[PDB]
């Protein structure tokens, strides 16, 4: 029962996404990005958007920027609910997944009522968003946000201090700070080791500069610490979502350059 | 007998089920710790076997010797355990 | 008559055994914000019978494996588990055995083989690794499981489960000896490979890996019957149901209530806790529990003597 | 029922013959676990109660199980087991051969329990095994030394 | 009644009811359509309610839901696992990526459909086929099984 | 709500009381209206068999002062 | 030494309790107002028939009805 | 909802916080 | 409190016509609840909406036998609901 | 601005507090309370056939080809729905109908190829091809999923009333 060497094999899901894009136009390659990592459906689009906007030296209108940060964060929650609850299902805790997949479900509905698709929206396009938010979404992205916290709190009362979660997670996969930068970890994995780097604060993109959030840095980096970090960004994203609802500007959602 | 009757019904019920099942649908011994554990298990088992007569031995007229004996057995085995916890034993 | 008394005490348990899976797939459900199975039949009552029929009909594929250490293993698992209900002392037992608890301890011990035999029989790596670890914690837990009972017996006076009904006529053995109840409950959770202690056959698919259809079912049935039996032993040894000699069924009525609640508890434990690591599990028994049990074992040889309470044999 | 014992005795010899043909390490473990079951019954057949269940409790699931346990770890390898089974049957009837001759010239139940001491409330086994703590407290100490010695002795063999 | 044909039909139905009420799926979870199935398992659309178990190993699985692209490297495996299931087995292709080839149909590493590697019984359409749609697809498998008449063909054969 | 887990339990409970009431009345009906005597030690058997030898061919039959 | 017992009671809070009991069971018997009774209460319990001796004479043994005031008594067991 | 005021209190006591304020049943 | 809970359960059982009528609703849906009947479409179908129930279950359709002569009483299908009433059921439009 | 998620005397009170936490499993009991609490909450599941999960007007669902109220099919075969389809799903070949007008002889959406992006809904100038609300079109055979003009036009006629309502609700937004 001891692992001497792990050689992960990859490509069981290689599909050609990088070659296929060369044969497609910029707007018809946007749907590929949603599929690249589809737990995080939109946040991925924003990266292509930004990239295509830079090449054109065009920037999205003010309302679109806030939207992208609004749905950018909602998407972060969606990913963390996936990562924390799926982590537990493999560990053996199954009730957190059902608790938070109901909240996920409710979020998907935001996607659907904004894009049309539950996931794989194609809403964030290279020049802003595709269509303004439906007349009424903001209010519901509030009711949900107003409550989601308690739902994160519950998971906590079940796992953060479980006498057993800690054991299987604490002091497992500790990664040094120097080694994390060396192997290009660049994520919570770095942040969990105590390196302070959030590309959202260091190199602001969209209007993530106009919001105020706290990066959840960690010490004694290990599976448990990073987890705590992911639960904390779920918390911090609710702080960013609140603001976006409180301060989203009247305006157009796509560049005016036909 | 009374017990036999029950038990053979018990086997019959199970053999009936397996049959229905089939008839109806017509090398590394790295963990010497594993072995180690298992050695301990019998040493503890055997010990249990020595402790198993204690319910009858409670009623023994001596009493003093009973407890003096039983306490010595439990203590010496526990020390065996203790030494399992001093070297790299029981730490799989 | 005696035959009729074998149908009762068996069928009734088998029918109840089926209704536990249902009350597991619904209590886990509502705890997780979901109705659970209610669409087949009324409120899911026909649900247990439905997959039983699906399981027996599906092909019992015999792997390209032994053919006996493969079919002996589920037969042994169901036979021992249903057998251990023979001496249980609900009101008055079916076959009263003077050394009854030794029968229950010995019969449980034999089930570890079924795991060993099934793992060797499958002849695939996942099965053998799972069986070796599974056998390890089962017998590891047996060692504290047995000592915890020996402490009990010494305060009961005999090995016969029938005596405890007379020992617990004034107070449950939980009040005294609660520290062991907890340790009996956790050990009952390990020996039925239920959740907190269910590393074998986890999301990692151990001895069901190659078992499908009828063989799957028999162990399967066995596990759940055990789930009840061990809970029932907790409900006789530590939670003593009130006994009135004039009306024997209030004993069985309360035995019914306490067994269902403690059976409900391991269902509730499963949904509530992540599974322990293989060594985490043995670390508990050999480090955390065995020293507690051996010492509290001595306290239970001393409590009788100096409190002049040596229990009456017979 | 009469001669219940001889039948069992015969089964015990069959299991020992199986262990003697040295079948595959774990297929025969079963064999032991079988005759251990059988011997458990016989001791329980002569009135023995505790001694009978002790073996079932200790040799059956404690030792034997640990035995196969190790078999899986080592000596689990494989290469005629059916031939062994075939010859096993050969000697089974051969036991009858011997049995026939014995019966040929000399009736169980005539006596299985020798004196019943019918009026007695302190007559079972386990009262005798509990003499480890009164009047036979030297067998208890030497057994204890062996177990204590075993923990120390085995750790070097592994190391 | 006693004319055997009737008796046979009734029996078959029972058999069909048992398999159709309790279908234990297994989710290879290729790609993303897996996320849309985890949603089915989740509380809004409980799969268990219908008798579908959340998870199952291949030995004990009645239906395989292929969610996601079946890439050329994973194609030998899919088959293995399909071939390692019981005699009454079924396959519900989920996702345009597995019904046909989907956005990645013309790629060099994607099999254009799983029905080229495993026989498929119900094809559930949609890039992330909606969880309700999978549920519709699982329910149509249940109507497909209900209609199957194995013993009556035995009797009439 | 949670109202529904009860159906299933009811059928478990009912199936766990049957056994205890059944075994404890098939004894009081196959032992002449009296609990089945428990022969734990030789003496309890003796009196049990002595009684058999006392009258009829069954122990529950209990001859009294009027004999 | 206080620490040897204050952290060992905070962390490792099993072996402490474990040993404590080991000892308390090794002491109570030595010091108790009842320990003596066990060997008596069990001694008294009459399991084997008490065979009567011949009355050669001059004996304090209870003659005739055992109820005679002479002999051993278990009033200690009573009102115990 | 439809807590009845006793299942709600068992719910509040067991959870340790007020779920009534942040319910799982979305309403108009 | 719970007695009113019990009266609500009794009214739900009495609500679906006779003992036989609720047995019919019981078997095909497995859920008994009473709601105002918003509409009955020409293909046999009956639609009920209850404001009190949560968003997921406040609108439900009880399917009818042979809506195109198919023996649909037991093999209920999602597609049976007509396109006009599909959006009302899925909450696409509040208006019936 | 950063925050330390897990960055960190021994008193009997403290220790006794900590030892009780390990000995009587106090935090484990805390976790059981949470699940018992929900057991009492109303389950969120919906009867799937009887009650349907809500989808708002933009839901893409299943392809349909609309027709003018008069009855003339909207598509005029400009074929840019084919041009912008990311998956190459739509195949269109056209010829002047005898009327002299421009119509598509063959319009084939391969739904297994389609990834339901909804750009075709976007691209059409006459808005002839629309993402219809229905999501339940699972089919026994692969061929049924391939759709020619007649199936889509038939799909359009069946769902036209709701498609018209959906486009009515969302056109101001577009
Ligand atoms: C055991 C005896 C019954 C206990 C009990 O019913 O507790 C539920 C009762 C109410 O539960 P709840 O979660 O508040 O119900 C939600 C609404 O308040 C009330 O929910 P509602 O607004 O839906 O009220 C109507 C409801 C009202 O239902 C009833 O109260 C009648 C139930 C009759 C069961 C026979 O009727 C229904 O919804 C249809 C289901 C009817 C019963 C279905 C289950 C039958 C189980 C049969 C075997 C038991 O809980 C208690 O009062 C305490 C019971 C003991 C707890 C420990
Ligand atoms: C991979 O295989 C699987 C498991 O292992 C992880 C499971 O345990 C599970 C989860 C377990 C469950 C509670 C659901 C399955 C339940 C059953 C098989 C119940 C079987 C029911 C019976 C045989 C009833 C017995 C009835 C009688 C004989 C009565 C006679 C009088 C599943 C579904 C599974 O697929
Ligand atoms: C009642 C019968 C009791 C018989 C006990 C026999 C003890 C001696 C060992 C006999 C088995 C080994 C042998 O020689 O035969 C090989 C054979 C091998 O059988 P097998 O087919 O299972 O092993 C090989 C499997 N293949 C080849 C497919 C990989 O043994 C048997 O046939 C089964 C023996 C069962 C023994 C009786 C078990 C009763 C319940 C025990 C609990
Ligand atoms: C013994 C265990 C139970 C065996 C089956 C008992 C009856 C099962 C049954 O009637 O299934 C319901 C089904 C009816 O339900 P159904 O499955 O046709 O439709 C269900 C519709 N939903 C899912 C929406 C609720 O009855 C049958 O069609 C088969 C009956 C066969 C009876 C043969 C003789 C007995
Ligand atoms: C499958 C194998 C495992 C089966 C389950 C485990 C069975 C365990 C049996 C333990 C031994 C029986 C026992 O302890 O008590 C039997 C009882 C004698 O005890 P007691 O009642 O105290 O007698 C004096 C006072 N009455 O009264 C009797 O002596 C009854 C006669 C003995 C019955 C013993 C059990 C018989 C089992 C028969 C089937 C065995 C199948 C073995 C299969 C493996 C191959 C051999
Ligand atoms: C492992 C544990 C090692 C230590 C074991 C200690 C065992 C202590 C037993 C105490 C028994 C007390 C009751 C004795 C009853 C009796 O009559 O036995 C005879 C003899 C002397 O005892 P007694 O008569 O009490 O003498 C004092 C009289 N006022 O009693 C005896 O002397 C014989 C029994 C004890 C003999 C111990 C001799 C060996 C000591 C350890 C050697 C090394 C370990 C060997 C294993
Ligand atoms: C029956 C008798 C009792 C049970 C005996 C059988 C088990 C004996 C186990 C002894 C283990 C000694 C040991 O080395 O443990 C050290 C303990 C745990 O350390 P470790 O195993 O490395 O685990 C670290 C990660 N948790 O880390 C510790 O430092 C634990 C320290 C425990 C002792 C603290 C004092 C407790 C109170 C002692 C009272 C008197 C003890 C008995 C005196 C007898 C003579 C009068
Ligand atoms: C004069 C007085 C003489 C007597 C003195 C007595 C002194 C007071 C009693 C002292 C002992 C009290 C506690 C005894 C049982 C607990 C023993 C124990 O320590 O648990 C082991 C483990 C510890 O947790 P861990 O953090 O892993 O270990 C830290 C140290 N290494 O804990 C665990 O891992 C537990 C894991 C449990 C998983 C399942 C949890 C289920 C919880 C619900 C059920 C609880 C039990 C219900 C019982 C019902 C009735 C039987
Ligand atoms: C996304 O990756 C996936 C998993 O791990 C995260 C799964 O466990 C599973 C299995 C989950 C279920 C619905 C049984 C799937 C489907 C999967 O693809
Ligand atoms: S179909 Fe759409 S969703 Fe399913 S896998 Fe292919 S891309 Fe991901
Ligand atoms: S775009 Fe609209 S109109 Fe032009 S061809 Fe495609 S469908 Fe017909």
């Amino acid at each position: 029962e001891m692992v001497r060497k792990c050689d992960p094999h990859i490509g069981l899901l290689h599909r050609g996404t990088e070659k296929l894009i060369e044969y497609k136009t910029y707007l018809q390659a946007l749907p590929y990005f949603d599929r690249l990592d589809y737990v995080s459906m939109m946040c991925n689009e924003q990266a292509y958007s930004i990239a295509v906007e830079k090449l054109l030296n065009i920037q999205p209108p003010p309302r679109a920027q806030w939207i992208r940060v609004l749905f950018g964060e909602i998407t972060r929650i969606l990913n963390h609910i996936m990562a924390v609850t799926t982590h537990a299902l493999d560990i053996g805790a199954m009730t957190p997944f059902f608790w938070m997949f109901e909240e996920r479900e409710k979020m998907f509905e935001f996607y659907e009522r904004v894009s049309g698709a539950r996931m794989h929206a194609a809403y964030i396009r290279p020049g802003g968003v595709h269509q303004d938010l439906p007349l009424g979404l903001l209010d519901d992205i509030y009711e949900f946000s107003k409550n989601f916290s308690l739902r994160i709190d519950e998971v906590e009362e079940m796992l953060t201090n479980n006498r057993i979660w800690r054991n299987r997670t604490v002091d497992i996969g500790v990664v040094t700070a120097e080694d994390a930068l060396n192997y290009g970890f660049s994520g919570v994995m770095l942040r969990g080791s105590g390196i302070q780097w959030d590309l959202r604060k260091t190199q602001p993109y969209d209007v993530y500069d106009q919001v105020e959030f706290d990066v959840p840095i960690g010490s004694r980096g290990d599976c448990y610490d990073r987890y705590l970090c992911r639960v904390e960004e779920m918390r911090q994203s609710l702080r960013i979502i609140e603001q976006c609802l409180n301060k989203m500007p009247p305006g157009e959602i796509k560049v005016d350059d036909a | 007998m009374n017990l036999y009757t029950v038990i053979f019904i018990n086997i019959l019920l199970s053999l009936t089920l397996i049959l229905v099942a089939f008839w109806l649908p017509q090398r590394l011994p790295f963990s010497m710790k594993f072995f180690l554990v298992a050695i301990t298990f019998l040493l503890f088992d055997l010990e249990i076997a020595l402790l198993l007569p204690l319910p009858w031995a409670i009623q023994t007229i001596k009493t003093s010797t009973m407890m003096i004996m039983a306490f010595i057995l439990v203590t010496i085995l526990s020390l065996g355990l203790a030494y399992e916890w001093t070297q790299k034993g029981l730490e799989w | 008559m005696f035959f009729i008394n074998i149908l009762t005490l068996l069928v009734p348990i088998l029918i109840a055994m089926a209704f536990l899976t249902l009350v597991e797939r619904k209590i886990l459900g509502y705890m997780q914000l979901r109705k659970g199975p209610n669409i087949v039949g009324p409120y899911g009552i026909l649900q247990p019978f439905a997959d039983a029929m699906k399981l027996f009909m599906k092909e019992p594929m015999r792997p390209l494996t032994s053919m006996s250490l493969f079919i002996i293993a589920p037969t042994l698992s169901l036979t021992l588990a249903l057998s251990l209900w023979v001496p249980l002392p609900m009101p008055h037992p079916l076959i009263n055995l003077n050394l009854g608890i030794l029968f229950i301890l010995a019969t449980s011990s034999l089930s570890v083989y079924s795991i060993l035999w099934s793992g060797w029989a499958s002849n695939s790596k996942y099965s053998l690794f799972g069986a070796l670890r599974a056998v390890a914690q089962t017998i590891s837990y047996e060692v504290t499981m047995a000592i915890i009972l020996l402490s009990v017996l010494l305060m009961n006076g005999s090995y016969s489960l029938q005596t405890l009904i007379t020992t617990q006529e004034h107070m449950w053995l939980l009040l005294p000896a609660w520290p062991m109840a907890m340790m009996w409950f956790i050990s009952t959770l390990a020996e039925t490979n239920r959740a907190p202690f269910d590393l074998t056959e986890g999301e990692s698919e151990g001895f069901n890996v190659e078992y499908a259809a009828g063989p799957f079912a028999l162990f399967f049935m066995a596990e759940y019957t055990n789930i009840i039996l061990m809970n029932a032993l907790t409900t006789i040894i530590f939670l003593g149901p009130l006994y009135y000699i004039n009306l024997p069924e209030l004993y069985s009525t309360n035995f019914m209530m306490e067994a269902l609640l403690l059976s409900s508890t391991f269902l509730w434990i499963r949904a509530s806790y992540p599974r322990f690591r293989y060594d985490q599990l043995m670390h508990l028994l050999w480090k955390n529990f065995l020293p507690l049990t051996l010492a509290l074992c001595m306290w239970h040889i001393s409590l009788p003597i100096f409190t002049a309470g040596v229990p009456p044999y017979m | 029922m009469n001669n219940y014992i001889f039948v069992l005795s015969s089964l015990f010899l069959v299991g020992c013959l199986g262990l003697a043909l040295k079948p595959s390490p774990i297929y025969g473990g079963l064999g032991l676990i079988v005759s251990g079951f059988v011997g458990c019954l016989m001791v329980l057949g002569f009135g023995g109660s505790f001694l009978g269940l002790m073996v079932f409790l200790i040799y059956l699931g404690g030792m034997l199980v640990v035995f196969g346990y190790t078999t899986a770890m080592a000596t689990e390898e494989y290469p005629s087991n059916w031939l062994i089974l075939g010859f096993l049957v050969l000697g089974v009837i051969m036991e009858v051969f011997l049995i026939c001759v014995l019966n040929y010239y000399d009736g169980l139940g005539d006596w299985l329990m020798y004196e019943v001491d019918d009026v007695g409330v302190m007559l079972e086994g386990g009262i005798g095994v509990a003499a480890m703590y009164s009047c036979a407290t030297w067998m208890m100490v030497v057994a204890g030394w062996s177990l204590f010695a075993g923990i120390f002795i085995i750790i070097e063999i592994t190391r | 009644r006693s004319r055997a044909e009737y008796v046979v039909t009734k029996l078959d139905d029972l058999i069909n009811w048992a398999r159709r009420s309790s279908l234990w799926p297994m989710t290879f979870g290729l790609a993303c359509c897996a996320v849309e199935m985890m949603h089915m398992a989740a509380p809004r659309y409980d799969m268990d309610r219908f008798g579908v178990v959340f998870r199952a190993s291949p030995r004990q699985a009645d239906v395989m839901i292929v969610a996601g692209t079946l890439t050329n490297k994973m194609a030998p495996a899919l088959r293995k696992v399909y071939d390692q299931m019981p005699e009454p087995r079924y396959v519900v292709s989920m996702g345009s990526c597995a019904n046909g080839g989907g956005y990645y149909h013309y790629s060099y590493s994607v099999v254009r459909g799983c029905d080229r590697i495993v026989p498929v019984d119900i094809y559930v359409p949609g890039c992330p086929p909606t969880a309700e749609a999978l549920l519709y697809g699982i329910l149509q498998l249940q109507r497909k099984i209900k209609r199957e008449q194995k013993l009556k063909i035995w009797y009439r054969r | 709500m949670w109202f529904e887990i009860l159906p299933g339990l009811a059928i478990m409970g009912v199936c766990l009381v049957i056994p205890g009431v059944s075994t404890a009345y098939i004894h009081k009906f196959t032992n002449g209206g009296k609990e089945k005597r428990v022969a734990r030690v030789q003496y309890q058997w003796y009196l049990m068999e002595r009684d058999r030898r006392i009258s009829g061919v069954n122990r529950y039959y209990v001859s009294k002062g009027l004999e | 030494i206080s620490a040897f017992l204050k952290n060992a009671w905070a962390k490792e809070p099993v072996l402490v309790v474990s040993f404590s009991v080991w000892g308390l069971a090794i002491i109570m018997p030595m010091i108790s107002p009842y320990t003596k009774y066990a060997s008596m209460i069990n001694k008294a319990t009459p399991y084997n028939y008490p065979v009567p001796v011949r009355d050669d004479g001059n004996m304090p043994d209870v003659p005739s009805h055992p109820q005679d005031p002479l002999g051993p008594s278990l009033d200690w067991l009573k009102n115990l | 909802a439809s807590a009845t005021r006793v299942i709600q209190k068992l719910r509040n006591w067991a959870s340790g916080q007020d779920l009534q304020a942040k319910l799982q049943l979305r309403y108009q | 409190e719970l007695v009113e809970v019990l009266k609500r359960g009794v009214q739900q059982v009495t609500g679906h016509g006779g003992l036989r009528g609720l047995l019919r609703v019981f078997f095909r849906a497995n859920d008994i609840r009473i709601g105002t009947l918003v509409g009955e479409d020409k293909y046999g179908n009956k639609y009920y909406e209850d404001n009190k129930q949560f968003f997921g279950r406040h609108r439900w359709v009880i399917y009818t036998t042979e809506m195109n002569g198919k023996n649909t009483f037991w093999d209920v299908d999602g597609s049976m609901v007509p396109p006009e009433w599909h959006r009302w059921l899925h909450c696409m439009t509040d208006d019936p | 601005t950063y925050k330390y998620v897990n960055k960190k005397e021994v008193d009997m009170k403290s220790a006794t507090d900590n030892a009780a936490r390990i000995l009587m499993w106090t935090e484990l009991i805390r976790g059981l309370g949470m699940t018992l609490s929900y057991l009492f909450r109303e389950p969120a599941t919906i009867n799937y056939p009887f009650e349907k999960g809500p989808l708002s007007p933009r839901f893409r669902g299943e392809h349909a080809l609309r027709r003018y109220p008069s009855g003339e099919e909207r598509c005029i075969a400009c074929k840019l729905c084919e041009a912008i389809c990311p998956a190459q799903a739509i195949t269109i070949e056209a010829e002047p109908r005898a009327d002299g007008s421009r119509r598509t002889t063959r319009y084939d959406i391969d739904m297994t190829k389609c990834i339901y992006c909804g750009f075709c809904q976007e691209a059409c100038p006459v808005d002839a091809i629309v993402e219809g609300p229905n999501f339940e079109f699972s089919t026994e055979t692969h061929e049924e999923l391939l759709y020619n003009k007649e199936k889509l036009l038939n799909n359009g006629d069946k769902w036209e009333a709701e498609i018209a309502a959906n486009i009515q609700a969302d056109y101001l937004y577009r």
Side-chain angles (χ1 to χ4, degrees), chain A residues 163-164 167, chain C residues 174 178-179 181-183 185-186 189 196-197 234 238-239 262 265 269 273 276 280 283-284 288-289 292 296 299, chain G residues 12-14 17 21 24, chain J residues 22-25 27-29 32:
Chain A
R163 192 174 312 275
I164 316 170
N167 281 353
Chain C
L174 177 63
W178 65 255
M182 297 187 184
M183 277 196 305
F185 181 75
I186 303 301
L189 276 169
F197 311 99
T234 300
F238 287 102
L239 276 66
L262 274 66
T265 315
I269 296 326
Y273 296 144
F276 272 89
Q280 185 64 60
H283 189 279
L284 188 147
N288 297 132
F289 275 16
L292 178 63
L296 295 174
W299 177 245
Chain G
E12 295 302 320
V14 175
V17 183
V21 172
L24 177 63
Chain J
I22 293 133
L23 291 162
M24 292 177 72
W25 315 324
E27 62 185 342
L28 288 197
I29 302 305
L32 292 185

Side-chain angles (χ1 to χ4, degrees), chain I:
Chain I
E1 268 190 5
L2 177 63
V3 296
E4 183 178 2
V5 175
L6 295 174
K7 186 200 306 186
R8 284 168 249 179
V10 166
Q11 293 300 320
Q12 270 149 73
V13 164
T14 57
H16 290 115
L19 189 147
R20 200 42 197 109
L22 176 63
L23 274 193
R24 271 154 214 272
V25 180
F26 198 39
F27 298 143
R28 292 173 296 180
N30 308 282
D31 186 82
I32 302 161
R33 293 181 295 103
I34 164 168
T36 59
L37 170 83
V38 187
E40 183 178 2
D41 179 65
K42 63 179 180 180
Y43 292 118
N45 264 321
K46 292 189 292 185
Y47 293 82
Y48 313 84
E49 170 180 6
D50 166 49
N51 297 132
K52 295 180 182 297
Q53 269 285 138
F54 62 96
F55 196 36
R57 311 204 329 160
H58 60 78
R59 306 172 164 170
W60 66 96
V61 63
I62 292 301
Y63 297 84
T64 301
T65 62
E66 280 128 35
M67 67 174 282
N68 289 337
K70 294 179 179 179
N71 64 34
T72 60
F73 177 78
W74 293 356
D75 64 9
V76 172
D77 289 345
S79 295
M80 286 167 50
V81 296
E84 184 178 2
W85 275 86
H86 177 106
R87 59 176 182 183
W88 178 82
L89 177 63
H90 298 238
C91 308
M92 293 177 182
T93 48
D94 61 356
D95 184 1

Side-chain angles (χ1 to χ4, degrees), chain F residues 12-13 63:
Chain F
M12 279 192 58
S63 291

Side-chain angles (χ1 to χ4, degrees), chain A residues 88-143:
Chain A
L89 262 180
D90 302 330
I91 304 301
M94 68 193 88
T95 77
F97 162 103
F98 293 79
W99 297 356
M100 302 303 251
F101 261 54
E102 183 65 13
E103 315 315 295
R104 187 166 185 174
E105 160 83 22
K106 300 179 176 180
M107 275 168 286
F108 270 12
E109 299 183 351
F110 297 146
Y111 265 58
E112 179 277 345
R113 54 184 312 181
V114 308
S115 67
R118 295 191 90 220
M119 86 195 260
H120 294 344
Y123 190 54
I124 300 189
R125 299 198 180 178
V129 128
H130 181 219
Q131 312 185 24
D132 207 340
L133 302 185
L135 182 45
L137 174 80
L138 293 185
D139 299 23
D140 302 5
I141 307 189
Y142 176 62
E143 311 293 349

Side-chain angles (χ1 to χ4, degrees), chain C residues 43, chain F residues 1-4 6-7, chain H residues 1-4 7, chain I residues 2 5-6 8-9 12 32, chain J residues 40:
Chain C
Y43 303 115
Chain F
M1 293 300 293
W2 53 261
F3 298 170
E4 304 177 350
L6 304 191
Chain H
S2 65
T4 299
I7 303 301
Chain I
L2 177 63
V5 175
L6 295 174
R8 284 168 249 179
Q12 270 149 73
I32 302 161
Chain J
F40 288 130

